[PDB]
Design a protein around this ligand. Structure first.
Ligand SMILES: *[C]C1=C([C])[C]=C2C(=[C]1)N([C][C]([O])[C]([O])[C]([O])[C]OP([O])(=O)OP([O])(=O)O[C][C]1O[C](N3[C]=NC4=C3N=[C]N=C4[N])[C]([O])[C]1[O])C1=NC(=O)[N]C(=O)C1=N2C#C[C][N][C]1[C][C]C2=C1[C]=[C][C]=[C]2
Ligand SMILES: *[C]C1=C([C])[C]=C2C(=[C]1)N([C][C]([O])[C]([O])[C]([O])[C]OP([O])(=O)OP([O])(=O)O[C][C]1O[C](N3[C]=NC4=C3N=[C]N=C4[N])[C]([O])[C]1[O])C1=NC(=O)[N]C(=O)C1=N2C#C[C][N][C]1[C][C]C2=C1[C]=[C][C]=[C]2
Lengths: 499, 494
């Protein structure tokens, strides 16, 4: 029944909020809809895989909050395999390469590719992380889809196709589904294009030994009986002195404050008294999550390594069920595996098939790309379709369709009386990730601490010291990369020299 | 507790479904979240206004289902005033005109305007009403916003601005918010551009005497104690032999079947066991409703009529809080009033103001456009901001952002085990309107009747005889309208 703060949702954000508040000496309850904690992270354990992350998994440099929280809980990271060559598969052909990005040899295509990435970052610099709607051209960029932006920016099909794959992979949505402003914000608040797509020195550098699900599990252990599983919140009443929170299984909870640590649209599952203010009421119907099936194919050995392939494949084209893979072999070199995401429309399309049919398509693709018959002999397969999750709504995170961020973005983390808003979607650095969940959870917790008069206002937003275990190399550009012209820039140079 | 069918939602669609099923001899319960029926229709009554529709109000020719249902309930329509001249206000200036559409005098602008409307209808003819995702170019049109389409089609700013107003008014959303495919379907399934925006011979021809809220109210009377007010559904359990439906106030209902007669996204407010199939699970997070405040300013007399103005104003520009008005005077000529919609981003922007501040902005605008100081002396004001409604989500209806209709559209009315889907959003003719609510409610009811073996499959979808009270004149085009070239067409000819 009675406590200081009810936290709705036991994912990383809710658990981090509850832990902070508990550590501060407050009585907290976590109400979790599912029979488990973790939310969009889920570590499956069986004999065949030992352990596997079926949701959120990767961490990297600049993600200092999740790294610190996990370290405190007794967890370790290991490096995702990127020792050998990456593969770029284009027009039914594989091109091995070293370094983070597939080389471009055609000089026009090179200028186009260079300009695209550069422009994405240039545009991002105009977008405040904590207030994207305050960008000078916010409205213009928000009233455009990423598809429209790509059509304007890319003078080659090659750049457009790779840019499209980049969008699909980053936000599990089609270029035509998402606001250009929102997507540009999303990339910028992750530290830019290089940081977001890189394995080495980027978001995909590392995984947790034993799985990411341990983060939420170990906090639950610390909180004891304070975490209530199978308690979906259905009703929040703020008419009285204490907030009343009701669950589906008929239980009633009373608190001074509430943290909502669920995906914004999942707020729809709760009936509010009094009704939510107009802007939030409408906002929560406007913010869908993306579509993804995470698939892991297991092999007897990491055979790709013997061919000097690290396991990273970037695969162009509609036919490919998966567009980006990573080696998912354990740090010990066993339980050899390839991880791939079936993204956006392909998640929708391929969900109609059986598990076995999906496995077959993946193996035949990998056999083609790696040029290896061994890819046709999987020993095991695991997958998770996040689109079917009632209490997630999708994965990895919430996307904003055109026009929504400028009109409703201000509302995202605006408190509603005694309800404060956590969840990775309300973060300002690595929003969408486990890192963002920690930031948002701890910030929401601190908002309540300030409301109670326990901390000053300037302590609500707290900086994080850099991890000593996972140091961040700065993102650099060469002179040529900075100053080489775009395609229209080169054409203008030709038109001017013709005088 | 126990019945044949639980209907979730007591708006027109749910009420029509419940009435049909009740008339067939089944035991029906209606579970309604609010302390009233009607949903997106609401008729306010007080001495100052007598009665006023604050939500859905207008009906017109081809809307035969709502007309028949209302007639059976003892209701009558009257004609919205369009006797005198309409006004097109452009660049701070009023241009009175007769007929449905504002004249265009510049020949290039004329060609551009003509081509736009014609192209909208041409495109719509390729879109099946019952399956828009089956249009030959469905993906292409769905992956584009209406803003993108307008940018391609309109060679003049004049046409683009008017086209924008048209979109805003029809679907309470910005051109950049909505799929081109969805919007083109929306217009086509209302009978085309002429039918959708016309007062005379169109969707705004008539209102119900006494208000549209009477439709749901009178059905509730017919159903007696079967309608349960203040019963928001929170949980539907389909694991057992009978469906279990739980409400917020702790009551449990058991039925053989369920009709969901709420806006698709409001399905999110219900916890499902077993979980919804993947496609619907995601669909209901992808389908927002538009943004609108309906505002009615009352005056001592319908003074605009004396100046040979009917009360219809089409008002261009960002500054104007309202872009289209209609005379809202009662058929008796009293309770003189002007109705306007504050739409899309302007609803969001102007909601921050007080009621009094909004009234002032409306009156000053009307005084400008009508050229009358009398517009500055309102006797009364009523408004309703539908964006604040927990159990509506907005108004008039659900819009589809780019990419959603082709990917998730098939799911809209696909049954989930024993749950069937009503609501105006699932209609194929005047979806979005009271008319569509009747169609969907009665069709959903008939799906259950067929599932029970009570009617054959070909009786699920039923045609409606034309109303004798509100006959439909066919939409015609002139020879020049059909064959005059577009702007690029004329340039190609040069
Ligand atoms: C799903 C997913 C996947 C598949 C993958 C991934 C992901 C995901 N991610 C993301 C994460 O996970 C997130 O962010 C997090 O987790 C979030 O958290 P939060 O905020 O906390 O939330 P959640 O989890 O959801 O929780 C919530 C909770 O609540 C609950 N509920 C609901 N409702 C309710 C409740 N309760 C009570 N009541 C009511 N009503 C639920 O149940 C839950 O529990 C990510 N992340 C990271 O970090 N990392 C990673 O890994 C991940 N992933 C992804 C990835 C991707 N990446 C990409 C980009 C670029 C690139 C890539 C790859 C490769 C290359 C490149
Ligand atoms: C709001 C609005 C406004 C402002 C206006 C208007 C409208 C609206 N409209 C629309 C209508 O109203 C609709 O469609 C209907 O109503 C629908 O119905 P339904 O389907 O049935 O649905 P609702 O109503 O919503 O109902 C539902 C119910 O449910 C319930 N719930 C929820 N949730 C829940 C429940 N329950 C239990 N549980 C749970 N969970 C609720 O509460 C409800 O009750 C329209 N319509 C028509 O027809 N007409 C008209 O008038 C209208 N309006 C509009 C108009 C416009 N127009 C335009 C276009 C073009 C033009 C114009 C104007 C001028 C010129 C031109």
């Amino acid at each position: 029944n009675k406590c200081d703060v009810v936290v709705v949702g036991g994912g990383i954000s809710g658990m981090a909020a509850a832990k902070l508040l508990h550590d501060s000496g407050l009585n907290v309850v976590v109400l979790e809809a599912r029979d488990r904690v973790g939310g969009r992270t889920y570590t499956l354990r069986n004999q065949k895989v030992k352990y596997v992350d079926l949701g959120g998994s990767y961490v990297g440099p600049t993600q200092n909050r999740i790294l610190r929280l996990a370290k405190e809980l007794g967890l370790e990271t290991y490096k995702v395999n990127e020792v050998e060559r990456l593969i770029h598969h284009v027009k039914g052909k594989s091109y091995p390469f070293r370094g983070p990005f597939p080389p471009v040899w055609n000089p026009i295509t090179y200028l186009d590719h260079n300009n695209f990435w550069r422009t994405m970052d240039d545009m991002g610099r105009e977008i405040p992380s904590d207030a994207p709607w305050k960008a000078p051209l916010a409205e213009e960029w928000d009233n455009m889809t990423m598809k429209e932006l790509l059509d304007k920016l890319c003078w080659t099909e090659s750049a457009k196709q790779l840019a499209t794959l980049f969008v699909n992979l980053c936000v599990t949505a089609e270029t035509h589904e998402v606001s250009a402003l929102w997507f540009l914000w999303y990339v910028k608040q992750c530290g830019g294009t290089t940081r977001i797509i890189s394995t080495t020195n980027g978001g995909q550098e590392r995984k947790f030994v034993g799985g990411s699900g341990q983060v939420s599990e170990r906090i639950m252990d610390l909180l004891g009986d304070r975490v209530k599983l199978e308690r979906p919140v259905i009703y929040i009443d703020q008419t009285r002195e204490n907030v009343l929170v009701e669950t589906l299984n008929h239980e009633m909870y009373e608190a001074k404050y509430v943290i909502s640590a669920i995906p914004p649209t999942l707020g729809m599952k709760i009936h509010f008294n009094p009704p939510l203010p107009m802007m939030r009421n409408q906002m929560i119907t406007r913010v869908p999550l993306g579509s993804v099936i995470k698939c892991i194919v297991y092999y007897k050995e990491p055979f790709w390594r013997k061919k000097d392939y690290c396991g990273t494949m970037i695969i162009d084209g509609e036919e490919a069920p998966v567009a980006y893979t990573l080696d998912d072999t354990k740090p010990e070199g066993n339980y050899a595996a390839i991880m791939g995401f079936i993204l956006a429309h392909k998640a929708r399309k391929l969900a109609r098939l059986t598990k076995e049919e999906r496995l077959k398509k993946l193996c035949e693709l990998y056999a083609k790309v790696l040029g290896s018959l061994e890819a046709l002999e999987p020993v095991h397969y695991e997958e998770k379709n996040w689109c079917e999750e009632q209490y997630s709504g999708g994965c990895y995170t919430t996307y904003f369709p055109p026009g929504i961020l400028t009109q409703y973005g201000r509302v995202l983390r605006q408190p509603v009386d005694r309800i404060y808003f956590a969840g990775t979607e309300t973060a300002t650095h690595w929003s969408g990730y486990m890192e963002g969940a920690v930031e948002a959870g701890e910030r929401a917790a601190r908002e309540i601490l300030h409301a109670m008069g326990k901390i000053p206002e300037d302590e609500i937003w707290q900086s994080e010291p850099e991890s000593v275990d996972v140091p961040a190399q700065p993102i650099t550009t060469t002179f040529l990369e900075r100053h080489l012209p775009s395609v229209p820039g080169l054409l203008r140079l030709i038109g001017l020299t013709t005088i």
